Amino acid sequence: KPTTPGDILLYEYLEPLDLKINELAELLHVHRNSVSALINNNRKLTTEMAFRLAKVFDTTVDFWLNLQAAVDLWEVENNMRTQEELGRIETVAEYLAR
Template identity: 65%
Template sequence: MNNHKDLRIPTGPGDVLLYEYLKPLNLEISDLADMLNVDRNTASALIANKIPLTADMVSRLAKTFNTSVKFWLNLQKNSDNPR
């Protein structure tokens, strides 16, 4: 019997953006940039999980995708503090 936990890297906000929103909706990074009113480099960095979500960006994402602010905050928190 194996007594150690299998560690899984938490799903980052960028992964959720890509696989749960952009791909199913056939959106490109430039579309996301336009929707969030940010430049393409910022949208790309979000998708790649290279920058953390700010309070402003969390609000933009929640409004754009009709989700709660808490949803995005929890994704970021879990990504920042893996168990």
């Protein structure tokens, strides 16, 4: 699995800065449970939470959203059931014609 926003948050900010999850939650103005879920990759990053992270850490909102975007695509590429389905989808071309 690609690097999640949670991975980046824990390994490149929290640990290097000696910052606790509860301190971050306070800085972000969200419940501790929301930060932990993000870090354990249990909840996808929302646009709103991306803005909060951008604020606290002084980055663009894009930076956080792109990490989530790459993970999202990875999840669909690796779901074989979904891939098989995309396999028999007929395009608007073959259709409009026939």
